[PDB]
CSV table of N, CA, C and O (backbone and C1' of nucleotides) in Angstrom, one decimal:
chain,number,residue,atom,x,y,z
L,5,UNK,N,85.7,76.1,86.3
L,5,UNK,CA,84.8,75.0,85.9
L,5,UNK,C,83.9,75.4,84.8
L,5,UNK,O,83.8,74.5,83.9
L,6,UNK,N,83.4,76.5,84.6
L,6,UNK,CA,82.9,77.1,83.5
L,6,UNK,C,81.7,77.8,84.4
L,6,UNK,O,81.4,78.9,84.1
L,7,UNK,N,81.1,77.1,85.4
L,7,UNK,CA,79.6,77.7,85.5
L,7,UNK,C,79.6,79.0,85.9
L,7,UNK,O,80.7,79.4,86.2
L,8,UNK,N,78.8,79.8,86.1
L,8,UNK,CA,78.2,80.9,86.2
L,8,UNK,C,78.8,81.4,87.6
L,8,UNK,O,78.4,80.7,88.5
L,9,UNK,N,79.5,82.3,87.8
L,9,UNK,CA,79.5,82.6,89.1
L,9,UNK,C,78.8,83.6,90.3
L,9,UNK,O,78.6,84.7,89.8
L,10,UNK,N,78.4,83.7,91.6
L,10,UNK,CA,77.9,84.0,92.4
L,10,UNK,C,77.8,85.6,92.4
L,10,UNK,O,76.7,86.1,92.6
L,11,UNK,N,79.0,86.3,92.1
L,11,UNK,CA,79.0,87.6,92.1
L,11,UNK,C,78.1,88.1,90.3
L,11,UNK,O,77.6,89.1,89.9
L,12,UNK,N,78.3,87.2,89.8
L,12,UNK,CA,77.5,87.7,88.5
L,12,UNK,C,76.1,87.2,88.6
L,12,UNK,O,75.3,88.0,88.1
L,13,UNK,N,75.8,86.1,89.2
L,13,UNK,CA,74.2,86.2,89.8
L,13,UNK,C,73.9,87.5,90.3
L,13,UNK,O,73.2,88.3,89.6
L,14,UNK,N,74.4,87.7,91.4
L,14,UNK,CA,73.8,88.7,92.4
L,14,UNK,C,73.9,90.1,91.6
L,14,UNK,O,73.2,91.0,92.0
L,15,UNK,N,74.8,90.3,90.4
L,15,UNK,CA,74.5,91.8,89.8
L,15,UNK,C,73.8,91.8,88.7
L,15,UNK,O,73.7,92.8,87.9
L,16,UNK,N,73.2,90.5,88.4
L,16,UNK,CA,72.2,90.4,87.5
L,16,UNK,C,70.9,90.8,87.8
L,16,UNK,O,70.1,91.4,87.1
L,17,UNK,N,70.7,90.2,89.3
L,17,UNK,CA,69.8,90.1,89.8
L,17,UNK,C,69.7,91.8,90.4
L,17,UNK,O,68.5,92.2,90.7
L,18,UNK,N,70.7,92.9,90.7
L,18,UNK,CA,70.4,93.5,91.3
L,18,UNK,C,70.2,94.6,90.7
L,18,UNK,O,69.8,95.6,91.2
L,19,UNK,N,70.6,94.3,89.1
L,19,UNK,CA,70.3,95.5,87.9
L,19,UNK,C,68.9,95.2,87.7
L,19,UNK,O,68.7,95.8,86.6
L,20,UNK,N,68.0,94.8,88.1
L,20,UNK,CA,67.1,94.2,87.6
L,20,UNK,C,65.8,94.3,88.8
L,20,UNK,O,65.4,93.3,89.4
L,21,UNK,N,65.1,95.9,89.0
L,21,UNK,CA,64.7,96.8,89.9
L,21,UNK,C,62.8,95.5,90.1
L,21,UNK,O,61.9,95.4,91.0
L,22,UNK,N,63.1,94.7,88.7
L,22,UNK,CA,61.7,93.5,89.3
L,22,UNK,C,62.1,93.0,90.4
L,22,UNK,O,61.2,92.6,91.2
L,23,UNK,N,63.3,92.7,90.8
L,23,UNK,CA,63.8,91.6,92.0
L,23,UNK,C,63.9,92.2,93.2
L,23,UNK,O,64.5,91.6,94.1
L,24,UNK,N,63.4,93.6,93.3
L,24,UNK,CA,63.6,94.0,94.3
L,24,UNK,C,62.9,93.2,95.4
L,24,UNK,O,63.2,93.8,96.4
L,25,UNK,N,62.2,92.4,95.6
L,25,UNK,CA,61.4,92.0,96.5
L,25,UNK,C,61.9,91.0,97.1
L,25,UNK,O,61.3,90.5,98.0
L,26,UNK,N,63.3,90.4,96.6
L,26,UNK,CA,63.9,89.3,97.4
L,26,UNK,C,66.3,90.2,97.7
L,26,UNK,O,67.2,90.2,98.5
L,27,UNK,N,65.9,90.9,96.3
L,27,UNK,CA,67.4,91.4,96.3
L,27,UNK,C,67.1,92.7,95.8
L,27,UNK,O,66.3,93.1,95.0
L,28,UNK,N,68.0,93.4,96.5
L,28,UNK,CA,67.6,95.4,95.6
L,28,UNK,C,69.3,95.9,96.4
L,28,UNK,O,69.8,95.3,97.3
L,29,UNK,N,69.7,97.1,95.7
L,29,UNK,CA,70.4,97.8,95.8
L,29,UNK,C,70.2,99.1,97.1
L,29,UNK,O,69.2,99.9,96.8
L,30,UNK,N,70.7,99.3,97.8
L,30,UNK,CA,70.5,99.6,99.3
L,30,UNK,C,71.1,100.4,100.2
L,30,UNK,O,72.1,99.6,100.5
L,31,UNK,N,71.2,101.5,100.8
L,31,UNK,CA,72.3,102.2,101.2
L,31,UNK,C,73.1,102.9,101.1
L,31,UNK,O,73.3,103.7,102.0
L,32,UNK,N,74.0,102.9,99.4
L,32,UNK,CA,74.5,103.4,99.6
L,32,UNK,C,76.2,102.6,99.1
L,32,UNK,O,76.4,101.5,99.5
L,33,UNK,N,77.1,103.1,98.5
L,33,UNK,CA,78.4,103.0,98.2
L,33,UNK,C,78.6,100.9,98.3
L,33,UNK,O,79.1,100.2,99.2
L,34,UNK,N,77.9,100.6,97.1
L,34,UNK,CA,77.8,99.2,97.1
L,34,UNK,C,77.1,98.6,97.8
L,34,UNK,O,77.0,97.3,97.7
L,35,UNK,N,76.3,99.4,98.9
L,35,UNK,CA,75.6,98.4,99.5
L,35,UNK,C,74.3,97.6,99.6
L,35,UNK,O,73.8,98.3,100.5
L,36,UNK,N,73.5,96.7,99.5
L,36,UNK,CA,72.8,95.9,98.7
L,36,UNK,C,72.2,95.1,99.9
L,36,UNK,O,72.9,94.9,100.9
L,37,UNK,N,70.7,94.5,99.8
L,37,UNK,CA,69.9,93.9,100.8
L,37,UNK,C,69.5,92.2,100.5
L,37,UNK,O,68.5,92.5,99.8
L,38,UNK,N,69.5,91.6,100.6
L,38,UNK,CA,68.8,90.4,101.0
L,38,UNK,C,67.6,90.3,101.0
L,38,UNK,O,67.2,89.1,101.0
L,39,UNK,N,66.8,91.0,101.0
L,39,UNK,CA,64.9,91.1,101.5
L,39,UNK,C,64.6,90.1,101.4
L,39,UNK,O,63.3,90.0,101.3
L,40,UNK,N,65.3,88.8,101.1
L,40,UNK,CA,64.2,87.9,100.6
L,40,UNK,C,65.3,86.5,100.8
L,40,UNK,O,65.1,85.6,99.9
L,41,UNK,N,66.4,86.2,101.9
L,41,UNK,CA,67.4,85.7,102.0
L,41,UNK,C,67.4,83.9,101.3
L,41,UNK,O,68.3,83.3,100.8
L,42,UNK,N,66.1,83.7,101.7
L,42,UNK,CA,65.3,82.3,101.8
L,42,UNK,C,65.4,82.0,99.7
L,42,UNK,O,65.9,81.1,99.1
L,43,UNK,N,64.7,83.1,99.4
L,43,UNK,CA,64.4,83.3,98.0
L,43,UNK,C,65.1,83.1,97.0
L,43,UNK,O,64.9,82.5,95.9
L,44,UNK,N,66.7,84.2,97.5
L,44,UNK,CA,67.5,84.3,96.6
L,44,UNK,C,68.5,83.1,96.7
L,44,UNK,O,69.4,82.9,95.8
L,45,UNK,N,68.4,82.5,97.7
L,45,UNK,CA,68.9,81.5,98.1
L,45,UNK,C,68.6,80.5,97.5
L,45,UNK,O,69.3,79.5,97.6
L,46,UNK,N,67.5,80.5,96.9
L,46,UNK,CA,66.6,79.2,96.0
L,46,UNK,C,66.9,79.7,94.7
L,46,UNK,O,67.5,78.9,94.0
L,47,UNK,N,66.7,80.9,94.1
L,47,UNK,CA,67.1,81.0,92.9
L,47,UNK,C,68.4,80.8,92.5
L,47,UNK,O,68.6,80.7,91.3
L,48,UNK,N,69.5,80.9,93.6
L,48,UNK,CA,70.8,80.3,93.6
L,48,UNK,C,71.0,79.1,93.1
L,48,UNK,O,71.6,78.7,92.2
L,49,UNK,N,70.4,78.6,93.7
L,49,UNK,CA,70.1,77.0,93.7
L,49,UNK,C,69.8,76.4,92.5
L,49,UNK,O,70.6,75.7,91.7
L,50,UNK,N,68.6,76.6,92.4
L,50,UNK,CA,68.4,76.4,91.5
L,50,UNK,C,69.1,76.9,89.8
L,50,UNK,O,68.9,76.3,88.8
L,51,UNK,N,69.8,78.3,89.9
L,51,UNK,CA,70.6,77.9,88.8
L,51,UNK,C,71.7,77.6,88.7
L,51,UNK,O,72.5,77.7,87.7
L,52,UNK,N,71.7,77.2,89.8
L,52,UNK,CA,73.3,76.2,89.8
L,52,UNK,C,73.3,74.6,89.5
L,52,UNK,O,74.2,73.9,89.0
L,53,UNK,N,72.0,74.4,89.8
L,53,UNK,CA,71.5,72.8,89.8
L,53,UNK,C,71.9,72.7,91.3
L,53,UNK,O,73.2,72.5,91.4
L,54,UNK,N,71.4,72.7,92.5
L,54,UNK,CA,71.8,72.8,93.7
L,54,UNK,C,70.7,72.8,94.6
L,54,UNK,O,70.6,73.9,95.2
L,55,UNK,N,69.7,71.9,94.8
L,55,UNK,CA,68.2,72.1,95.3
L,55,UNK,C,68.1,72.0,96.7
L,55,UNK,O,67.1,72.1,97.4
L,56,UNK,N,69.1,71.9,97.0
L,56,UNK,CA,69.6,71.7,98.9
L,56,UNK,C,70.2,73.3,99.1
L,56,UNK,O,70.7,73.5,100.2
L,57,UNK,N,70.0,74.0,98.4
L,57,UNK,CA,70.5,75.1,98.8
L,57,UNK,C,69.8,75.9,99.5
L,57,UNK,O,68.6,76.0,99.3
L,58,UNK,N,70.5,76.5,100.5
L,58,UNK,CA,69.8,77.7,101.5
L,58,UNK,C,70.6,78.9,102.1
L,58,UNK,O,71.8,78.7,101.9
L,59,UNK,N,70.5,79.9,102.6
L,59,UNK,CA,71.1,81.0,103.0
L,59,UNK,C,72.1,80.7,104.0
L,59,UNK,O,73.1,81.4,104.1
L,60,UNK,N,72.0,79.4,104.8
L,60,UNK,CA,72.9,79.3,105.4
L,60,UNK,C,74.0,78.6,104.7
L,60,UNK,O,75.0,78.4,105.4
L,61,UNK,N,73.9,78.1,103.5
L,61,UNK,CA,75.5,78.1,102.7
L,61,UNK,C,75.7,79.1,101.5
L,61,UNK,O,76.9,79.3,101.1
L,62,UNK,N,74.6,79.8,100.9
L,62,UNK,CA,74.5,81.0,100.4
L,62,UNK,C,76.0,82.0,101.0
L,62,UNK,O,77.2,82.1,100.6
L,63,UNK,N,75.2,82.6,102.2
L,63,UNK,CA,76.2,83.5,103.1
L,63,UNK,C,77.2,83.0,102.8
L,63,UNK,O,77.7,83.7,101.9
L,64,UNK,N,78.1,81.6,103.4
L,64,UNK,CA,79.0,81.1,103.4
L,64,UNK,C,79.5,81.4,102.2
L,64,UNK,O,80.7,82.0,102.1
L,65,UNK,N,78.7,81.1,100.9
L,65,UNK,CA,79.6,81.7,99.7
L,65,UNK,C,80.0,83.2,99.5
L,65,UNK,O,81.0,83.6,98.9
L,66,UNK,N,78.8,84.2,100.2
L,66,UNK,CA,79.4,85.5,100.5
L,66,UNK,C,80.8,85.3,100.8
L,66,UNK,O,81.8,85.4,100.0
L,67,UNK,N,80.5,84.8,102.5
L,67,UNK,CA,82.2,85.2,102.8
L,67,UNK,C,83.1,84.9,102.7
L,67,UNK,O,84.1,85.3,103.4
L,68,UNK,N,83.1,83.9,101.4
L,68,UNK,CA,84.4,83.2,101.2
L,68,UNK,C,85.0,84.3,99.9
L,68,UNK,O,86.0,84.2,99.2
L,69,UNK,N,84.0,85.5,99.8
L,69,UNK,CA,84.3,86.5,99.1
L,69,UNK,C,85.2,87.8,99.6
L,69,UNK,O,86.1,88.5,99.0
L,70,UNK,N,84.8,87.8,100.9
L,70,UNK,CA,85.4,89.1,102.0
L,70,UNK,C,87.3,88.5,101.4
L,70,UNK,O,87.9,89.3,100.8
L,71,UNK,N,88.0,87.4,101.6
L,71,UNK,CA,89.0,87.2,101.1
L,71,UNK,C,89.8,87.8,100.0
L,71,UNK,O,91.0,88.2,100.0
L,72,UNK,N,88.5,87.7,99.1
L,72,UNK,CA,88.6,88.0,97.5
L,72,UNK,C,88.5,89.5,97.3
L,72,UNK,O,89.1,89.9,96.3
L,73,UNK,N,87.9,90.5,98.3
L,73,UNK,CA,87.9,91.7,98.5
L,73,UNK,C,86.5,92.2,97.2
L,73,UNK,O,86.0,93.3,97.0
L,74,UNK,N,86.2,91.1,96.8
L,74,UNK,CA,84.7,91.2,96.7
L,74,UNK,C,83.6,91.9,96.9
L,74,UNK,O,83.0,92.8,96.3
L,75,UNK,N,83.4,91.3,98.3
L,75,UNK,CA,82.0,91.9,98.9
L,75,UNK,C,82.8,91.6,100.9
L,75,UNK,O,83.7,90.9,101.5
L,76,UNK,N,82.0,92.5,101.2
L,76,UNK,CA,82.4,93.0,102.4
L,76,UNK,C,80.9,92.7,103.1
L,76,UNK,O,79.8,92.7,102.5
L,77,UNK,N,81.0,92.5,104.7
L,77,UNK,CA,79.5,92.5,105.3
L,77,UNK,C,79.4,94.0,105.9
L,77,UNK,O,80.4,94.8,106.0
L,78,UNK,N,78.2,94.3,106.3
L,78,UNK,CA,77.5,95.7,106.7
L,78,UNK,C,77.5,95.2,107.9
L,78,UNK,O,76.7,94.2,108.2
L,79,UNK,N,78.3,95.7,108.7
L,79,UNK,CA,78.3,94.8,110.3
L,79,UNK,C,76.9,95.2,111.0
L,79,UNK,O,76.4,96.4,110.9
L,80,UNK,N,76.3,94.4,111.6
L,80,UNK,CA,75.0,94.8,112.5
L,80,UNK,C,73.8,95.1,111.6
L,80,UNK,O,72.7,95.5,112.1
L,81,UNK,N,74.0,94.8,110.3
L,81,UNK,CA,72.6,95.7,109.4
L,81,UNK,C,72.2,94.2,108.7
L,81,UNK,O,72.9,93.8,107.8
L,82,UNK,N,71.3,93.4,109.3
L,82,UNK,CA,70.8,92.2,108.9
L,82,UNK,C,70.5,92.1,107.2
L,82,UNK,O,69.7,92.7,106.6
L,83,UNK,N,71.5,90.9,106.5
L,83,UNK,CA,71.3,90.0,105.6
L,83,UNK,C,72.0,91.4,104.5
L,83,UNK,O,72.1,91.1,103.3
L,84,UNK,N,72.5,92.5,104.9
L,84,UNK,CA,72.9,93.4,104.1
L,84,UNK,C,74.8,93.5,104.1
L,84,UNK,O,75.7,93.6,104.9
L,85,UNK,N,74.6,93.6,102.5
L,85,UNK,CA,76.4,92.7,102.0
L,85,UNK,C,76.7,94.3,101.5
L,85,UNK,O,75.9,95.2,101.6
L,86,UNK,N,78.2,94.5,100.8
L,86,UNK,CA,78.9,95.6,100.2
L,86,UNK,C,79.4,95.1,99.3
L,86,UNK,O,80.3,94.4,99.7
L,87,UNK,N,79.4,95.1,97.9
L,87,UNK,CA,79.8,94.7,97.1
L,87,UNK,C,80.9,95.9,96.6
L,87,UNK,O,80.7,97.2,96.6
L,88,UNK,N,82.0,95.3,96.5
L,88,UNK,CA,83.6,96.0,96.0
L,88,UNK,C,83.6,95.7,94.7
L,88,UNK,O,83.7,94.5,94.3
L,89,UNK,N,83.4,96.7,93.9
L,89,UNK,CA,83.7,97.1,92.8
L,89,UNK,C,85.3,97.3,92.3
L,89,UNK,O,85.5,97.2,91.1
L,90,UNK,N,85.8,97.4,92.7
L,90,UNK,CA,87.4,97.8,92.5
L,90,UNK,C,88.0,96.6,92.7
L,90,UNK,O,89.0,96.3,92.0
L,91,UNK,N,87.6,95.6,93.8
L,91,UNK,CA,87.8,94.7,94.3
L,91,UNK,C,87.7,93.5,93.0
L,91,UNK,O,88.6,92.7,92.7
L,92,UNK,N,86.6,93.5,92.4
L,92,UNK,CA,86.3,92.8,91.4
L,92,UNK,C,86.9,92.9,89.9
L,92,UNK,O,87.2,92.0,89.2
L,93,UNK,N,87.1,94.4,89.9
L,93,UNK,CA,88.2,94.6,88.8
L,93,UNK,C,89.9,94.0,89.1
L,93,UNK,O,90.7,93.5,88.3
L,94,UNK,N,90.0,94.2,90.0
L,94,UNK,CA,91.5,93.9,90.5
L,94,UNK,C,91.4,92.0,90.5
L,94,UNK,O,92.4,91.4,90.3
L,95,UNK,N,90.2,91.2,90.6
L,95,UNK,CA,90.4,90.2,90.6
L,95,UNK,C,90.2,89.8,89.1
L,95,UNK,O,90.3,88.6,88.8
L,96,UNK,N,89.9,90.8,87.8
L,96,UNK,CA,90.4,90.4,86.7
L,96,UNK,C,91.3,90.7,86.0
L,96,UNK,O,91.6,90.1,84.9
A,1,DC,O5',92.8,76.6,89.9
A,1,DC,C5',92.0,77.4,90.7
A,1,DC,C4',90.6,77.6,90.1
A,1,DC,C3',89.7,78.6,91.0
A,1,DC,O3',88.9,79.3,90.1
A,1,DC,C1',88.8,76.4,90.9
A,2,DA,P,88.3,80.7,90.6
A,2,DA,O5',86.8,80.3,91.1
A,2,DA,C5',85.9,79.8,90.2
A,2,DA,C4',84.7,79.3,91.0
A,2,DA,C3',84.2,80.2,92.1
A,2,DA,O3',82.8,80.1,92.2
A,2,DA,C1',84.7,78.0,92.9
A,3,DC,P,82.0,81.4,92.8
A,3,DC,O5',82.1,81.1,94.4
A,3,DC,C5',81.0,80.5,95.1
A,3,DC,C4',81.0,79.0,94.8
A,3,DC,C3',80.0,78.2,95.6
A,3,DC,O3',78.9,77.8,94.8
A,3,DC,C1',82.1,77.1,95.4
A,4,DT,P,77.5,77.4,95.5
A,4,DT,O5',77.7,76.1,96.3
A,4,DT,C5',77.7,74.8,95.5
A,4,DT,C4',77.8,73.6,96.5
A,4,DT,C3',76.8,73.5,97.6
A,4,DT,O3',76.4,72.1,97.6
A,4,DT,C1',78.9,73.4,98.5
A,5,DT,P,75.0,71.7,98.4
A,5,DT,O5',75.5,70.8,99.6
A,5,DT,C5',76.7,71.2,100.3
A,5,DT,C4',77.1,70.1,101.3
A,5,DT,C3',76.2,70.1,102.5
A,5,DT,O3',76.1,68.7,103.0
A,5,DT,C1',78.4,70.9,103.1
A,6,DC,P,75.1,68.4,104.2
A,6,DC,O5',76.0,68.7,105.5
A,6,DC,C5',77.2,68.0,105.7
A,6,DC,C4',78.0,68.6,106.8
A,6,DC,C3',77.2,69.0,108.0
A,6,DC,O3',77.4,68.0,109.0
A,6,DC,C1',78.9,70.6,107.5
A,7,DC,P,76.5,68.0,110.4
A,7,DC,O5',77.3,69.0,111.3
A,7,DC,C5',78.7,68.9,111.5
A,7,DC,C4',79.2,70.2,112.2
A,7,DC,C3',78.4,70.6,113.4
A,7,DC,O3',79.2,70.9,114.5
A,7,DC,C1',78.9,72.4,112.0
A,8,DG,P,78.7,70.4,116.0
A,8,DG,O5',79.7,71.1,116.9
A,8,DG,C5',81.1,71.0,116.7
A,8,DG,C4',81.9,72.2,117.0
A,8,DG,C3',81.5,72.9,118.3
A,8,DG,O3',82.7,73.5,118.9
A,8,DG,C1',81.1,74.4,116.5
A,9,DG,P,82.6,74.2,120.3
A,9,DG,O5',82.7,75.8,120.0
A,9,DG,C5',83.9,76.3,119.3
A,9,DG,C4',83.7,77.7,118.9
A,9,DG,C3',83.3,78.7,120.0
A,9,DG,O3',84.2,79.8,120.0
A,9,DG,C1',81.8,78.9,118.1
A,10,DT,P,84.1,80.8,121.2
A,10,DT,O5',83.3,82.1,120.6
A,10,DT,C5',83.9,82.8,119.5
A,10,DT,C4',83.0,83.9,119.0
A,10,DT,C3',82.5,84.8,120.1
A,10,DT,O3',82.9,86.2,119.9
A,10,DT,C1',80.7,84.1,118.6
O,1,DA,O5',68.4,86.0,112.2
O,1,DA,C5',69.2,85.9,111.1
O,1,DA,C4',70.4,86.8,111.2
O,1,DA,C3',71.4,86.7,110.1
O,1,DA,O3',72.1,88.0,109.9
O,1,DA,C1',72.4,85.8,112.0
O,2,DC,P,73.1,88.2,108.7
O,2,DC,O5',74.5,87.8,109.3
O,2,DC,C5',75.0,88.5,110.4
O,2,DC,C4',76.3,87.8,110.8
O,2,DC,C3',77.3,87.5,109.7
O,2,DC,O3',78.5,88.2,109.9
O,2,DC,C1',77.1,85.7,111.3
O,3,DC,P,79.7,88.1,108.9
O,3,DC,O5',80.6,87.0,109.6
O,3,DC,C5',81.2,87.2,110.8
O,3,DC,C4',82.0,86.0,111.3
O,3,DC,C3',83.0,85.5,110.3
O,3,DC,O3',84.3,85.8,110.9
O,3,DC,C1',81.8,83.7,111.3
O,4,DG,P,85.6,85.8,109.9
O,4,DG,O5',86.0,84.3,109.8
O,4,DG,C5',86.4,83.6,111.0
O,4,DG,C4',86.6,82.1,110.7
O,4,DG,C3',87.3,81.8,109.4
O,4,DG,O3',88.1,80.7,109.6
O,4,DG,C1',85.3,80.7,109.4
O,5,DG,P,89.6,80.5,108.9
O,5,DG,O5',90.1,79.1,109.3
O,5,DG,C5',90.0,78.7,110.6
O,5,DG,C4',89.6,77.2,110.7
O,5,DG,C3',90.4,76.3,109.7
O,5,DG,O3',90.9,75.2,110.4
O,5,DG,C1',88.1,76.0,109.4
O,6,DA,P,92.0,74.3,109.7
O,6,DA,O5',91.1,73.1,109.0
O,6,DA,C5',90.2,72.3,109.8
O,6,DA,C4',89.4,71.5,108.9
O,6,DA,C3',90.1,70.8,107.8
O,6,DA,O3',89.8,69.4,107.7
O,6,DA,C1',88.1,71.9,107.0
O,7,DA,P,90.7,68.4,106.9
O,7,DA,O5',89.6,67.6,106.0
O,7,DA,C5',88.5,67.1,106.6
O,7,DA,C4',87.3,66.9,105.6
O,7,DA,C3',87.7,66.2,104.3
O,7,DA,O3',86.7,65.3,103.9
O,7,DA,C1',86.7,68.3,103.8
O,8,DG,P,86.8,64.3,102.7
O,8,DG,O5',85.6,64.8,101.7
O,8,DG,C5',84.3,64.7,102.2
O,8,DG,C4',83.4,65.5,101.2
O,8,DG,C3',83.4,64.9,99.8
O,8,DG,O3',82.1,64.8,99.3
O,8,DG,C1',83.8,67.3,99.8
O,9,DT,P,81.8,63.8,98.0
O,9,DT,O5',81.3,64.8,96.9
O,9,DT,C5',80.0,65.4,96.9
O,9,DT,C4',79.9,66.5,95.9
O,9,DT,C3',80.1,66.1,94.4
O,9,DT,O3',78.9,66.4,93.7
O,9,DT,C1',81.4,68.0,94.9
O,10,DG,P,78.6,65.7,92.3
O,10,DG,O5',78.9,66.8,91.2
O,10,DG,C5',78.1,67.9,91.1
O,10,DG,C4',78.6,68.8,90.0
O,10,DG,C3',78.8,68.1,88.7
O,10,DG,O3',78.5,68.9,87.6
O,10,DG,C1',80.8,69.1,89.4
DNA sequence: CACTTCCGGT
DNA sequence: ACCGGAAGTG
C-alpha cells in the first residue's frame, strides 16, 4: 500500500535511546521491551492515522509477525518481543 | 498487501 | 497478557 510499516516503526523508535521510556532495547540477542505498551501503541496510531489504536491490536500486529519470522515473543517476560534480524533480511 | 477490528479461548 | 482465526479497512 505504500505506508510505513510496523517493523520499521519499532527500529526507529528503538535506535533512538530518547524512547527508552515507552520502547528500549533489552536482554539481549534482539530482544526489546514495551515499557510503555499503552504509549507506543498511541504513537503507532497515530502515525498510521489510526486513533482507535491500542496494544491490544498493536500485539496482534506483533504476531501476525512470528509467521513472517520477524519477531518472535519472550515467552513469560511481560510485553517483551525478539526481533529476527535474519528473518527480516530473508523477507527482502 | 499489511495490517486493523473483533473477540472467544488459553 | 497472550494467542490466533476470521472478516474488514486504506
Amino acid at each position: 500500500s505504500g505506508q510505513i510499516q510496523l517493523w520499521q516503526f519499532l527500529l526507529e523508535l528503538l535506535a533512538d535511546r530518547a524512547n527508552a521510556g515507552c520502547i528500549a532495547w533489552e536482554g539481549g540477542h534482539g530482544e526489546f521491551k514495551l515499557t510503555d505498551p499503552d504509549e507506543v501503541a498511541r504513537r503507532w496510531g497515530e502515525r498510521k492515522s489510526k486513533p482507535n489504536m491500542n496494544y491490544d491490536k498493536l500485539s496482534r500486529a506483533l504476531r501476525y509477525y512470528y509467521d513472517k519470522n520477524i519477531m518472535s515473543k519472550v515467552h513469560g517476560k511481560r510485553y517483551a518481543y525478539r526481533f529476527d534480524f535474519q528473518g527480516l533480511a530473508q523477507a527482502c
